[PDB]
Design an enzyme around this catalytic site. Structure first.
Site, mmCIF file in Angstrom:
data_model
loop_
_atom_site.group_PDB
_atom_site.id
_atom_site.type_symbol
_atom_site.label_atom_id
_atom_site.label_comp_id
_atom_site.label_asym_id
_atom_site.label_seq_id
_atom_site.Cartn_x
_atom_site.Cartn_y
_atom_site.Cartn_z
ATOM 1 N N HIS A 101 -3.288 1.233 -4.487
ATOM 2 C CA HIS A 101 -1.975 1.880 -4.686
ATOM 3 C C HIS A 101 -2.034 2.970 -5.773
ATOM 4 O O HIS A 101 -1.070 3.178 -6.512
ATOM 5 C CB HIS A 101 -0.889 0.852 -5.112
ATOM 6 N N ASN A 174 5.545 -4.958 -0.784
ATOM 7 C CA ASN A 174 5.113 -3.906 0.162
ATOM 8 C C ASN A 174 6.187 -3.716 1.206
ATOM 9 O O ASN A 174 7.203 -4.377 1.183
ATOM 10 C CB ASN A 174 3.811 -4.326 0.905
ATOM 11 N N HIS A 365 3.300 -6.311 -12.581
ATOM 12 C CA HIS A 365 2.428 -7.475 -12.325
ATOM 13 C C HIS A 365 3.292 -8.643 -11.820
ATOM 14 O O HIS A 365 4.282 -8.992 -12.500
ATOM 15 C CB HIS A 365 1.699 -7.870 -13.623
ATOM 16 N N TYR A 388 -3.592 -8.743 -12.207
ATOM 17 C CA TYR A 388 -2.796 -7.612 -12.674
ATOM 18 C C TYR A 388 -2.885 -7.413 -14.164
ATOM 19 O O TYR A 388 -2.887 -6.266 -14.568
ATOM 20 C CB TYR A 388 -1.311 -7.685 -12.265
HETATM 21 C C1 HEM Z 1 1.119 -9.751 -0.750
HETATM 22 C C2 HEM Z 1 0.078 -9.219 -1.328
HETATM 23 C C3 HEM Z 1 0.120 -8.062 -2.291
HETATM 24 C C4 HEM Z 1 1.156 -7.206 -2.487
HETATM 25 C C5 HEM Z 1 2.588 -7.117 -1.835
HETATM 26 C C6 HEM Z 1 0.663 -6.245 -3.500
HETATM 27 C C7 HEM Z 1 1.413 -5.169 -3.936
HETATM 28 C C8 HEM Z 1 0.915 -4.274 -4.862
HETATM 29 C C9 HEM Z 1 1.607 -3.073 -5.307
HETATM 30 C C10 HEM Z 1 2.947 -2.598 -4.695
HETATM 31 C C11 HEM Z 1 0.869 -2.490 -6.289
HETATM 32 C C12 HEM Z 1 1.107 -1.191 -7.056
HETATM 33 C C13 HEM Z 1 2.124 -1.381 -8.249
HETATM 34 C C14 HEM Z 1 2.308 0.018 -8.815
HETATM 35 O O1 HEM Z 1 3.018 0.797 -8.190
HETATM 36 O O2 HEM Z 1 1.720 0.251 -9.888
HETATM 37 C C15 HEM Z 1 -0.348 -3.289 -6.469
HETATM 38 C C16 HEM Z 1 -1.311 -3.039 -7.392
HETATM 39 C C17 HEM Z 1 -2.461 -3.827 -7.611
HETATM 40 N N1 HEM Z 1 -2.715 -5.034 -6.933
HETATM 41 FE FE1 HEM Z 1 -1.566 -5.915 -5.498
HETATM 42 N N2 HEM Z 1 -0.620 -6.610 -3.889
HETATM 43 C C18 HEM Z 1 -0.992 -7.728 -3.134
HETATM 44 C C19 HEM Z 1 -2.205 -8.414 -3.192
HETATM 45 C C20 HEM Z 1 -3.104 -8.295 -4.253
HETATM 46 C C21 HEM Z 1 -4.231 -9.152 -4.475
HETATM 47 C C22 HEM Z 1 -4.555 -10.458 -3.645
HETATM 48 C C23 HEM Z 1 -4.816 -8.688 -5.597
HETATM 49 C C24 HEM Z 1 -6.041 -9.220 -6.324
HETATM 50 C C25 HEM Z 1 -6.217 -10.576 -6.314
HETATM 51 C C26 HEM Z 1 -4.149 -7.467 -6.044
HETATM 52 C C27 HEM Z 1 -4.550 -6.680 -7.114
HETATM 53 C C28 HEM Z 1 -3.907 -5.526 -7.490
HETATM 54 C C29 HEM Z 1 -4.458 -4.672 -8.498
HETATM 55 C C30 HEM Z 1 -5.764 -4.832 -9.271
HETATM 56 C C31 HEM Z 1 -3.456 -3.586 -8.613
HETATM 57 C C32 HEM Z 1 -3.604 -2.379 -9.487
HETATM 58 C C33 HEM Z 1 -2.463 -2.838 -10.454
HETATM 59 C C34 HEM Z 1 -2.545 -1.951 -11.654
HETATM 60 O O3 HEM Z 1 -3.517 -1.105 -11.872
HETATM 61 O O4 HEM Z 1 -1.627 -1.915 -12.492
HETATM 62 N N3 HEM Z 1 -3.122 -7.253 -5.195
HETATM 63 N N4 HEM Z 1 -0.238 -4.399 -5.604
#
Ligand code: HEM
Ligand code: HEM
Lengths: 726, 726
Positions: A101, A174, A365, A388
């Site tokens: 993202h 999402n 987060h 996060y």
């Molecule tokens: C239903 C499943 C998930 C949804 C709806 C989701 C949703 C999102 C969204 C919308 C963002 C961006 C937030 C922003 O705008 O800064 C994001 C970032 C991220 N997500 Fe998820 N995610 C999911 C699953 C996961 C999983 C399973 C992991 C790791 C175990 C993960 C790791 C991350 C990481 C590392 C970021 C970057 C966050 C940051 O740099 O601040 N995500 N996710």
């Protein structure tokens, strides 16, 4: 080097339609739009007018055009501290982008609930219809880098940071109601598969490549969200016109300690609406910033994005009553089985001041919950809690990321944590540990209670052995993809078939295409055959005999899963292109603009050059863009007023504009002699539904146009577009 | 056993044409292509086949599908160290992108000089024609992020790291021979002005916005490189078909201590070639990875990018003999005044294995010179020297970036520097300072000398006061822009006018357009009038009367500044689309394909679906892509063989394929009944230049098509394309 005498360099600080004024920082565009969080950023907002240029140490600069050198043609000198600070700051501007993202667009707004939810949750932000909670929302794609395009085919992120009186709650969701995978342990495998391939770092912003479809073919749990991605849900028209979902089942906890399972929804009050694929892919080239731009301009216009928060609520005792597991994030809960209860409204009403400082540095987060909410065992949610916070330590430079202004709570925060890179807070507490007597133990723990209490987790019963094992109840992969497929309109199903066909045609290794077609045969034979035919693959007898998967708790369809099956169109904030000529009939333009203004629909005046044209009555019409400069991809409908049509009748770009709009199912309205353009789009003296035509543009002509725009696109035209060469 | 039984998952390790095989890591695709640097990377290359999956600590993993939890539906446990390591590494994959030139594509290769240059430089890599120096080259755009598109209008970077026996030399150049600005102090202003605007971070990969043209309008030194950016130089067809330049005057120092001023050039042995704007912009949508892809695939095919290094050499005594200052980087040295002397050849013959490790982490820096080279007082070059080491401290995590494998010298490196984040080298020297006795003062300083000597700077006299002042010799801004303009063909001049008109049309504040037009009126009135007409602006009488700037040392043109005025076409490596039908005349296809193969021109067989079609004689023809899947944007010419034309005559995609190719000036050839498509593109019965037509594809049909391909595009078609709706 100064501003023009006429003040034309500065946008008016009033709402204005897209294109009317240059865009600006939110606090200069809308200074009187406030909320607690926006006000609290005032300690760090920095102006500029009437101030001297300085170093970061506050030293006035006399010559910002030259390095210090020994003679005017001589070597630069090491003692130029001004040059060194300026270049060193430039050299260190970039920080790592988000691992996923990375591409996203954000705005400030506020939320309030419609009625107190204290019966089912003690969360303070849900407790009173007149307690307003500031929010910051970032929308995003998933796969591409921060500099990738907006209107790719992908899932979209929809993250909301609520700055509540009892803490920050981040609802990190999402635009589809499930995810691709079941256990967080696979996340790096799935994201590596979708991202650019490691040898050559291709392709950007696209799942249309071997590794993604290799993983999909070998991991059927992915098929549900892949269906959503291959449908037009994967190419929204705007972030204002898509749904939002928290995906996981969470808990609400009331003052009596009762847990209720919940799934979070956002409903777009501007309605659901998506592009079609040829339009979305060409739009990544003509304007790769289209969704970022459209969101910012909607807010400057007053077309504030609004969304209704809604909850699907399942009592604890009903956890096991569906034929899917509530904790499986690849399964959705159909609204026919569990309705969405309306909870409150969120309005995004101010753009940031500085994209880097506020958007790029924002940290969301899903572990940031507040009393009244809790987790479940969903094994994808559980693993997200390890990620996060961790990722924010490299991305934002250390553990004080909550002191970056955009991330700060508006409520009090006090604890015994100290130090870390870029520590802003200067703690006066004599103690940096508890229990302590030297500060009489402050700050103190707070027991849990009905309101203002400390956080306590719901005491869920845990019984099982320590295992790395997928729950057997998660091992079903075809029934939800089928439910989704069957709930789409026929044109939506055609678009799904086309998405799969287009993507798999880009997969170099043909056996992967075959394996995917075999998976589709386990979902629906009609879908599988239609994709197979486009790929030159022939289903075997065995494949033809695959028993379809069961209905979902008896459902044959659920129309809430379709974008379009149930009308919910809203034209406010949409845009029409008006193709000018050098002698426009002013009575047409008057009627056009009057009817558009009544419904809050914007217009962009286009011509074959920039500058102005003069209408039949002497009205000077400024031109917004050329036909090539602002293609039909960027508007919802096209109107051609009468006038000197010969001026534009043989202009290739003007004809092409209509051919492209027609192909992309947009309404087109042709007044008076502009009806001569019917011949370019091959379409009959009797007329056609989707083409508005009259002697002049009057009340009737405009009502018909606006009715078509409320239905978004002219689906009935689809059989007619394969023969047009556009 | 997830691999297909037939082994079709693995590309053949032999050169193959674009599209024939899946692409792979360079060491697996071309294991026998070696050089000293590629061999030296063997210590860090890691394989994978036949090895167990492990943690980074070497522990074999049993179940990489599940997190550890209490019960198969229970909560995830903190003790899952395998989950923790995998998610933590993923969480920290990203590093900051380069502040500029973030979008780039790279390969390995080698350079050899044609003869010893010992008479003019003591640089070891230029001393002996049998001396082979490994190189790593990265080509880039400037403005966009690492995830932005390739075929934007921008300057391109061309950076070459020479791994010489006397040190790394980085020749860090661009694809135009001047830069926008004069003094490094302004670099953050100019870059900020071209980059996305800070409130909303729009637009990506584009200079077509207010702040860029605001800065241009206020800083006329920019106009020369702006002219090059607005010409088709700003949109190369390939990294293989653009020029390279070091921009600044440097010095060569020979063993006798004589300095010669030098400017560096790269001549593309594949010729010069660019896209046209509508094509380039649309291609950023249909394939944002087009240049990265085409480079990778050219090397996989054996179409190795080759470039000739050349030097413009000016004796010290001639420093002041031109109308411009040699130290002014907004000025070019015309090849009519100072010819380029051919120096040697560079061939890029292997792709990387892992893009991030080798391309993303590569660090180039123009201060990385070797004995036999030196700097000059060019004030832009001088300030570069403070930036490139500095920026690498954040981007690459610290001061040991030269220990990242791709950046390591292949020659010895020893000194007294120690520690730093990420330190790999374990020093055994008892001493970490000099002078020391405890290690007999080793490693020791080396006196300068003819070969293998220490670096000593040329003893240039410096004389002047400490000033922040631009040399008056730099205060002339219009004569080089005019020399460029007058050196272009009439169609190149049209494309320049269209570039400025398209870009200014996206400037929202009209006064900025007017100010740019006033600057154009100081370069050439015909240019200024043409751009003004497209913007609806009328020149004032004062503007019509501005006197043109003087000629540059008596030249009123230099044809070496044109891409096309002197034919240098090379068809090898180019690609043709062949539009199939369901009963192709097999004799046409045999003639077409063998003709292409003889000249090293690739083909892609296209149809309305994937799979196969069968020719008149039963030959089975495999389909590479659909018409929509591989648009005419991606090829150099289009051939329609004879057959059952009715199959595709009413296919809108097939028709539009030809319309698009036609509009973008590409050669089109139509055999037999395929001439029925002449009506689609409005070609006259008696035909026209640039359309090859015959009863069959035999005789001279293919020679004619190949002659058109060698001239690149059909420039004479430009007056015809205006009318066509495409
Ligand atoms: C239903 C499943 C998930 C949804 C709806 C989701 C949703 C999102 C969204 C919308 C963002 C961006 C937030 C922003 O705008 O800064 C994001 C970032 C991220 N997500 Fe998820 N995610 C999911 C699953 C996961 C999983 C399973 C992991 C790791 C175990 C993960 C790791 C991350 C990481 C590392 C970021 C970057 C966050 C940051 O740099 O601040 N995500 N996710
Ligand atoms: C004649 C003028 C210039 C030319 C030809 C040029 C060329 C380039 C090229 C080709 C790259 C990309 C190297 C790669 O592929 O990694 C680059 C990177 C960069 N340049 Fe320049 N540049 C010029 C001016 C400057 C100036 C005046 C400065 C600042 C004083 C500057 C600062 C940088 C920085 C910070 C990077 C990123 C380097 C990195 O992260 O490793 N450039 N330049």
């Amino acid at each position: 080097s100064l501003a023009p005498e006429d003040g034309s360099h500065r946008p008016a600080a009033e709402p204005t339609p897209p294109g009317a004024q240059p865009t600006a920082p939110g606090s200069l565009k809308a200074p009187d739009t406030r909320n607690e969080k926006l006000n609290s950023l005032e300690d760090v907002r920095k102006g500029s007018e009437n101030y001297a240029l300085t170093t970061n140490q506050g030293v006035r600069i006399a010559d910002d055009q030259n390095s210090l050198r020994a003679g005017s043609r001589g070597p630069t000198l090491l003692e130029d501290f001004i040059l060194r600070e300026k270049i060193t700051h430039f050299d260190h501007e970039r920080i790592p982008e988000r691992i996923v993202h990375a591409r996203g667009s954000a705005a400030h707004g506020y939320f309030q609930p419609y009625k107190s939810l204290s019966d089912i949750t003690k969360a303070d932000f849900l407790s009173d219809p007149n307690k307003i909670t500031p929010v910051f929302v970032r929308f995003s794609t998933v796969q591409g880098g921060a500099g990738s395009a907006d209107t790719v085919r992908d899932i979209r992120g929809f993250a909301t940071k609520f700055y509540t009186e009892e803490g920050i709650f981040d609802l990190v969701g999402n635009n589809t109601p499930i995810f691709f995978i079941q256990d967080a342990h696979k996340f790096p495998d799935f994201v590596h598969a979708v991202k650019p391939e490691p040898h050559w770092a291709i392709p950007q912003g696209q799942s249309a490549h071997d590794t993604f479809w290799d993983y999909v073919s070998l991991q059927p749990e992915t098929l549900h969200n892949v269906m959503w991605a291959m449908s037009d849900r994967g190419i929204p028209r705007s972030y204002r016109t898509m749904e939002g979902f928290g995906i996981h089942t969470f808990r609400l906890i009331n003052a009596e300690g009762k847990a209720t399972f919940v799934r979070f929804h956002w409903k777009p009050l501007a309605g659901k609406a998506s592009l079609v694929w040829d339009e979305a892919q060409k739009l990544t080239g003509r304007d790769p910033d289209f969704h970022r731009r459209e969101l910012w301009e909607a807010i400057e216009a007053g077309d504030f994005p609004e969304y209704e928060l809604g909850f699907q609520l399942i009592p604890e005792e009903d956890e096991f009553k569906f034929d899917f597991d509530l904790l499986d994030p690849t399964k959705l809960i159909p609204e026919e089985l569990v309705p969405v209860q309306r909870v409150g409204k969120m309005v995004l009403n101010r753009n940031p001041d500085n994209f880097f400082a506020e958007n790029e540095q924002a940290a969301f987060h899903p572990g940031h919950i507040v009393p009244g909410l809790d987790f479940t065992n969903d094994p994808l949610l559980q693993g997200r809690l390890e990620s996060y916070t961790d990722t924010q330590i490299s991305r934002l430079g250390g553990p004080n990321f909550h002191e970056i202004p955009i991330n700060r709570p508006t409520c009090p925060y006090h604890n015994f944590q100290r130090d870390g890179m870029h520590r802003m807070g200067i703690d006066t507490n004599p103690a940096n540990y508890e229990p302590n007597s030297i500060n009489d133990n402050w700050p103190r723990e707070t027991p849990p209670g009905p309101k203002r209490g400390g956080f306590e987790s719901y005491q869920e019963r845990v019984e099982g052995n320590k295992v790395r094992e997928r729950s057997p109840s998660f091992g079903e992969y075809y029934s939800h993809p089928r439910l989704f497929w069957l709930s789409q309109t026929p044109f939506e199903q055609r678009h799904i078939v086309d998405g799969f066909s287009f993507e798999l045609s880009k997969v170099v290794r043909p056996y992967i295409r075959e394996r995917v077609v075999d998976q589709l045969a386990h979902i629906d034979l009609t879908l599988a055959q239609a994709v197979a035919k486009n790929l030159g693959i022939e289903l075997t007898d065995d494949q033809l005999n695959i028993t379809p998967p069961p209905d979902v708790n008896g459902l044959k369809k659920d129309p809430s899963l379709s974008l379009y099956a149930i009308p919910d169109g809203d034209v406010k904030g949409r845009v029409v292109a008006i193709l000018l000529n050098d002698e426009v009939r002013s009575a047409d333009l008057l009627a056009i603009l009057k009817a558009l203004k009544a419904k809050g629909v914007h217009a962009k005046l286009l011509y074959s050059r920039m500058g102005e044209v003069t209408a039949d009555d002497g009205t000077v019409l400024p031109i917004a863009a050329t036909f090539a400069g602002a293609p039909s991809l960027t508007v919802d409908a096209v109107i051609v007023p009468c006038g000197n049509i010969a001026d534009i009748a043989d202009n290739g770009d003007a004809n092409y504009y209509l051919m492209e709009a027609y192909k992309h199912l947009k309404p087109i309205a042709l007044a008076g002699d502009a009806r001569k353009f019917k011949a370019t789009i091959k379409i009959a003296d009797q007329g056609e539904e989707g083409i508005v035509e009259a002697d002049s543009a009057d009340g009737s002509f405009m009502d018909e146009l606006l009715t078509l725009m409320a239905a978004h696109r002219v689906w009935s035209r689809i059989p007619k577009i394969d023969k047009i060469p556009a």
